[PDB]
Amino acid sequence: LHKEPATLIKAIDGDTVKLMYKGQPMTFRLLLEDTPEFNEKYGPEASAFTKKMVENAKKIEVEFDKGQRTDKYGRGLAYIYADGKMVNEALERQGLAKVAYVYKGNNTHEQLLRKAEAQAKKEKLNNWS
Ligand SMILES: Cc1cn([C@H]2C[C@H](OP(=O)(O)O)[C@@H](COP(=O)(O)O)O2)c(=O)[nH]c1=O
Ligand SMILES: [Ca+2]
Question: Catalytic center at which residues?
Answer without folding.
Answer: 29, 37, 75
